[PDB]
């Protein structure tokens, strides 16, 4: 079983570091596997269901 | 609010749940504009069967009758779809398999599966039915296939 991404409404933590540098270009040519964008109307916490 | 909940009256398995999972956000035509709906109305292959010969005009001729709806959620007991009002701003996601690049100010139209039926037909053997998907295509190829098919 491979570890998979999930968009569940986690209580995300806050880091001192910034992460923003080179992300838009790194999404194009993959710096890292298994990502997912979220544009404007879908960038939120998804509704909890179980 | 507007939505369509569609029952799966028997059950469904774990392979065809992963088959319906990859086909999320795709426009299918369905029969009636009721809130409740069964499996027999959602297929475009209620006319496009395997043991009989298809009729790509009559399949397409069937497609300007139906209401058109976008999938949101795939559940093992149900399929919850959202519909499309006849004058409505909405969102459509380019899932469709022969990848043609769109842009802003283009002109789409819905076509029957005209290059690969086997890609569009995924069979739901737990209920004795197969659900068949159309393909949304800009009209520069919408017309040009109907020029070629005749």
């Amino acid at each position: 079983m491979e570890a998979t991404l999930e968009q569940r409404p986690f209580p995300y933590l806050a880091t001192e570091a910034n992460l923003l540098t080179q992300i838009k270009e790194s999404a194009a040519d993959g710096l890292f596997k298994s990502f997912q964008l979220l544009l404007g109307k879908d960038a939120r916490e998804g509704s909890v269901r179980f | 609010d507007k939505s369509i909940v569609v029952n799966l009256t028997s059950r469904l398995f774990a392979d065809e749940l992963a088959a319906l999972q990859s086909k999320i956000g795709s426009v299918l035509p369905l029969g009636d504009c009721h809130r409740l709906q069964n499996i027999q109305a959602l297929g475009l292959g209620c006319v496009c069967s395997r043991e009989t010969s298809p009729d790509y005009i009559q399949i397409m001729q069937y497609l300007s009758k139906c209401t058109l709806a976008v999938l949101e959620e795939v559940r093992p007991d149900s399929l919850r779809l959202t519909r499309m009002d006849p004058s409505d701003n909405l969102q459509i996601k380019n899932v469709y398999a022969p990848f043609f690049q769109w842009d802003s100010n283009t002109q789409l139209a819905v076509l029957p599966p005209l290059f690969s039926r086997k890609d569009s037909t995924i069979v739901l053997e737990s209920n004795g039915f197969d659900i068949v998907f159309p393909m949304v295509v800009p009209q520069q190829l919408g017309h040009a296939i109907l020029q070629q098919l005749l």
């Binding site: 209580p11 933590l13 806050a14 880091t15 | -």
Partner: protein, 49 residues
């Protein structure tokens, strides 16, 4: 000469981690501090300090 830890950090699956590890197929890291954000004190925006 530098200063650093003498031992590793411990992580034990004792407590409420063990129930979801057995009943479900998953397990948190630090379930307790993770619980105090969701149910004990909701709608508090993340802040680095």
């Amino acid at each position: 000469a530098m200063s650093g830890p003498a031992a590793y950090a411990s992580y034990v699956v004792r407590g409420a981690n063990l129930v979801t590890a057995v009943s479900y197929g998953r397990a948190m890291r630090n379930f307790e501090q993770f619980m105090a954000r969701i149910v004990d004190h909701p709608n508090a925006l993340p802040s680095v300090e």
